[PDB]
A paper describes a structure:
The IALB_1185 protein, which is encoded in the gene cluster for endo-β-1,2-glucanase homologs in the genome of [name], is a glycoside hydrolase family (GH) 35 protein. Here, we showed using recombinant IALB_1185 that this protein has glycosyltransferase activity toward β-1,2-glucooligosaccharides, and that the kinetic parameters for β-1,2-glucooligosaccharides are not within the ranges for general GH enzymes. Kinetic analysis further revealed that the enzyme has wide aglycone specificity regardless of the anomer, and that the β-1,2-linked glucose dimer sophorose is an appropriate donor. We propose that IALB_1185 be redefined β-1,2-glucooligosaccharide:d-glucoside β-d-glucosyltransferase as a systematic name and β-1,2-glucosyltransferase as an accepted name.
Thus, crystals of the E343Q mutant (the mutant of the nucleophile) were soaked in a solution containing Sop4. Clear electron density fitting a Sop2 molecule was observed at subsites +1 and +2 only in subunit A. An electron density beyond subsite +2 is almost absent in the solvent, suggesting that there is no subsite +3 in IaSGT. Importantly, as shown later, electron density fitting ligands was not observed at subsite −1 at all. The Glc moiety at subsite +2 is hydrogen-bonded with the side chain of Gln106 and the main chain of Glu102. The aromatic ring of Phe391 undergoes hydrophobic interaction with the C6 atom in the moiety. In the WT-Sop2 complex, both the side chain carboxy group oxygen atoms of Glu102 participate in the substrate recognition at subsite −1. However, the distance between one of the oxygen atoms in Glu102 and a potential hydrogen atom generated from the C3 atom of the Glc moiety at subsite +2 by PyMOL (2.2 Å) is outer limit for van der Waals distance between nonbonded hydrogen and oxygen atoms. The distance is smaller than the normally allowed one (2.4 Å), as shown as overlapped spheres. This observation suggests that binding at subsites −1 and +2 competes mildly through Glu102.
Residue numbers in the entry:
A (entry chain A): 6 to 693, 698 to 716
B (entry chain B): 6 to 691, 700 to 719
Write the structure that this text describes.
Amino acid sequence: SEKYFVKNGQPHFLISGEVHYFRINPKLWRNHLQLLKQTGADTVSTYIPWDWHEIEEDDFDFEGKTHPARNLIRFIKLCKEENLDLIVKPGPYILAEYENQGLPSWLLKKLSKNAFALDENGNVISPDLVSYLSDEFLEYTFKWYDKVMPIISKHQKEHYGPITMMQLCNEIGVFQWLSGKSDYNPKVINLYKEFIIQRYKTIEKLNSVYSTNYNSFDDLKAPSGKIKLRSDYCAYFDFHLFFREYYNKYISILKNKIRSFGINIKLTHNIPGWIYGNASELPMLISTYSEIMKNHPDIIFGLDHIPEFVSFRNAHSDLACNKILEAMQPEAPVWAAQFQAGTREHHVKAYAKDLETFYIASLAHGIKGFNYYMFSQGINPEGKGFYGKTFYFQTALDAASNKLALYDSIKKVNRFIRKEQKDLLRTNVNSEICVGFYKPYFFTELISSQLLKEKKLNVEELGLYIDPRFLREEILFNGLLRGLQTLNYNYDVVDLENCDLKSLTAYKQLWITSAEFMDAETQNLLSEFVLNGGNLILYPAVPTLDNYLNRCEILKNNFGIEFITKDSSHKVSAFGIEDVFTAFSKKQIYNDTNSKPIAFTQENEICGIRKKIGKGELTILGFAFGYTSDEHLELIDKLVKLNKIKRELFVSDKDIQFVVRENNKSRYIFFLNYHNERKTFNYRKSSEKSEEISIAPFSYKVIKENK
Amino acid sequence: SEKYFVKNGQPHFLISGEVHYFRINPKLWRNHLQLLKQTGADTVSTYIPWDWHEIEEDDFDFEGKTHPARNLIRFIKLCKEENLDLIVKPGPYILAEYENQGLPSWLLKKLSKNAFALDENGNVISPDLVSYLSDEFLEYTFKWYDKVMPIISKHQKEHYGPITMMQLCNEIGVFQWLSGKSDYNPKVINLYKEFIIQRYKTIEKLNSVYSTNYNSFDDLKAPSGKIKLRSDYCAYFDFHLFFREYYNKYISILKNKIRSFGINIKLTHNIPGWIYGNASELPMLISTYSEIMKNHPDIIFGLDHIPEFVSFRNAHSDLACNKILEAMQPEAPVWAAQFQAGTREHHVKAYAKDLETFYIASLAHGIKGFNYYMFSQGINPEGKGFYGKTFYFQTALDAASNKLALYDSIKKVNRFIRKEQKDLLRTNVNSEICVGFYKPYFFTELISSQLLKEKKLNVEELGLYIDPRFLREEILFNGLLRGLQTLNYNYDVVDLENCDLKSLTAYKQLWITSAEFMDAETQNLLSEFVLNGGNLILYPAVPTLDNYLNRCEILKNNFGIEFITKDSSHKVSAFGIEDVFTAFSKKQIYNDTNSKPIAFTQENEICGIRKKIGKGELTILGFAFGYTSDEHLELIDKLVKLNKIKRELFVSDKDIQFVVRENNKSRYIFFLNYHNERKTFNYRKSEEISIAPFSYKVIKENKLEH
Ligand SMILES: OC[C@H]1O[C@@H](O[C@@H]2[C@@H](O)[C@H](O)[C@@H](CO)O[C@H]2O)[C@H](O)[C@@H](O)[C@@H]1O
Ligand SMILES: [Ca+2]
Ligand SMILES: [Ca+2]
Ligand SMILES: [Ca+2]
Ligand SMILES: [Ca+2]
């Protein structure tokens, strides 16, 4: 059952608003807090910028002695007086469109070149981009923590202060992503060499996996440049594995330091990945936290949602992100550390009537808490803005604390949440579909991404044809997940790593989007799933290689599949649907042994089959489709109906999205119109005269039923 | 002064709908045409696919002998019976999501390897991609023309047929754009060599310009791979010039063959470039047609507008494109050969209420005619779709001629246009701002584009810091042009090539977005402009190089400018605006003798000046800004107000966009709400109105005689 925040042994919907004390006239701090409280928010959230408080090396001001807005201590006391809990975020990085991402100018001037993140040629990637594990960086970070952490410790909830949560640093790795370049600092390269020796033990074992001919570990260099050989792909794959251990070591060092101050509050981190109003790359960024989330059950990750608009063009991003966070972090609530309010960019408008729908859609899509970012506009003091004087536009409050149009939208959404939170937080959706999350397909931020400058991964040079980024973006994120949401079929996402078979068994169908490679553990898990009675849908490929592109045919043999890869027209027929456009000329052509052929190439060769195996069912399609045609939705619909899965409602307009959330007491129907059309429609429960609804463009309705 | 289509000696708003007979049940051809006519549309437009009609080599069906939807003759007859003019588009390429882009399968099977576009290794780029000047391709094209062109000729309006216009081929060069790959067919490379020999005359002259080390023209190889040296940049620059001449040679061969059949109707071509609902790349595609537009005053280019949605996210794209086409094609009306109706992509919705506002915005932004693409949905016959069974979604009519939501929107907009066309077509905007179009910055489709994944141009490798695509997309298209439209300042665009000094004197300001390179002819033109009394705004660089990156400091010397390039904070102050975020660390720091400093680095070095030169005024900014902050709109506004330029209206809500269009007698005020907010505002000349989200209002004002 559901994960949710709890206050006083009852479900609590975390409603926070971001208010930057350092960007607001301190004579107006109280008015901002009062107006936030009056929306029904229970929490306020702020960065504590290292640059703002360590005004010169070893010169600290938290009391407003050198600038009134340096009076952190007073802001904390005002939070307590106005009955708001406080989330504090002291960095060292805050980003936050603050000069030098929040690092002091004096620090970046003073640090040696080996404090910085370095490219393949030894050059500084960016004058504000440190190497996370630089000894110099960590020494200064610790001296900053020595001053700000005693203040945070004294003002924690357990000492009757307002502070309930603290974020460690900010969006770890967001610059290795954005800058479009990875850190070849020698501290990093030496840690990588240690990681490889620990992983492989002998150069002979490494040479056997990579198919390389090194005489010693001293001959192994950090991979750089384009992947041309499978041995380059192997080296980069382990480099990805290493960076996940690297970020875990960084956050582990910050956490150990923080705990030494008697800070026992909840620790948080925040997930980047939205850009241009979609989040198809966020799954790659959350995959960079795989080792933190396994090692730190006490650090809760939240999402940084930046939709910019709310339409069918991005409707699927927030649900797919909320589902993937749940998959990687199943023991904590799904929540947004930064939940768009106003816009960071003047030229990229944020309409109250878009964001209001986003807020309701987020509830439909399972969000359990959020921090409106930004609730309050700021004015950068003293030239501190990265890109201009004003921080955010079209917020709930302007910097002067005037109510703007979003204020009433947030009050309306908060009112509904506070009325309903006791039941709403306990509601589930009935998912009969599970979609597999295979993390290794996402481990490409060094070699293949939307932000990366040079494409380093070209699978055709490795004798492959299914690119893992193309598969996870277009076949999974924009394809299957977009398709299921559009068709109003509930799905859950499961992390396949150390996945318990007992968790998969509750679903009517398990859907796996597969490349030509998949590890032995996952091939074995899916084999057992089907033999024991599971129903598996697998496309576009039966894998035949492992994560190092060495032979592994476990699943192919356990399923009694024979296939050859042949070129044909992109168009196939599947389940009687003609002219299904597929992504590749190459297809898997299956022997029809003990199977029903259900998809055919233009030469009528078999490119999909259905089989019974043990107590289970297998459907394999040897071709790739996402959602770029109507035939693709017809095909997803056909596949779902193979196990007689039904939608919760009959709705007369197929372009209306709904979510039914229920517990024992209560049912919530969320209707979402992601289209620029006033829609009049009727619906009824699949279970047992119809109700008529009119919905405005880009709008929502919520119906509560008492059961 | 305005350019517009004419019918019966009066202004005529060309309203066409695209209806693909080859994709529609012939029993329903008359129904589609009657419903199109009933919207007030006057013209219908279609491809005539070569693959569809030459069913096997030298076997032609135009009469539905082998499939009823091959009855082209009957469709043409129906157009006439239903009182519609017809636009025909017989290729040879049609694209149109048709298998093999409209070329016959039997042709692609039969052609020799030397008929195909080849990569630098001599490998076929794509089995459906021919070399445009292949002898074998033009031979088979001519044999297609020998059968379809006598039918088109017989059905011209001249012979009380319906045919009024014909498109030659389709988006010439589009495949080099989409792939980032040039045709290295030896026949193309031979024509390139001839182009280079013709241009430079001797290997010594080419070596002096390129700084190459060739002993003869025999050493010369077509450029390929990344640009590492200034000499590679030179070679690639001329390779782009060559492709513009090559496309002109191709369309000239088609044109002359067409004219040989007594076809005297108006000839057209079409311009692509919209990507994900914005058009910042479309100017690059306009630039590929520079030589066609110079040499064929009688071929009318129309735009392929694909906005997908209508909001502030893309509001500036259509105006910037319409203005640039006007600059390049001043003697023809700006029109949309493909004007979005429905969506090519099922997952990319096209809402009737969005497109209705796009159609009215298009009128505000000077469009004189359009062809709804697609008015009618199609079903691909017997697997001949590139993609699935269906061609377009959310159209005016489905393939079965069912009316869809867009139908009533088109009928409403068409009623307005017909009511107003006689006056509306003769209106212009009063532009006091002129923005220079310098085509060489756009000549990059083989080395730097939004569609080219692996960038071949990296200007830092050449000792430069201002990339021409960054300049033209972010500083010009999404920056200055977006800013002026947002601020409701009218602008015009002028082609700086062979530009008449007398045309520039009409304007109060000329804005030049300059890289470190600019040819001598443009440097001299801008020198004379200011010296004779013009007011020039120039940023982010005084250029010091020509198009071949050789020294050329004519403008710098004529204006008494001296500068050092120095690194500083991205933020500057300009005209007392603090914290103006600029694109580059590197800025020009100007000597201020005989000058007024008006912009400063964080350390107070002078990165902008104003000065008097002869009778005119110069404003130089040594930094790059587009529109990514409110300070950028503040800076554009202050720059415009240096020469006392005023908006036509005071409108109380700054986020309402307006366009005042007038002639001697008539004024139209177009109000455009690109925002998801009901807005109430008032207006007066330099009075109270409510506009729905993503909507519009048009007010008419009669002008009083004096
Ligand atoms: O949309 C891409 C990502 O953008 C980040 O915003 C950064 C901002 O944090 C930073 O202060 C400025 C200046 O360096 O650059 C922006 O691009 C967001 O934090 C991410 O959530 C987002 O995915
Ligand atoms: Ca001090
Ligand atoms: Ca030389
Ligand atoms: Ca005009
Ligand atoms: Ca001077």
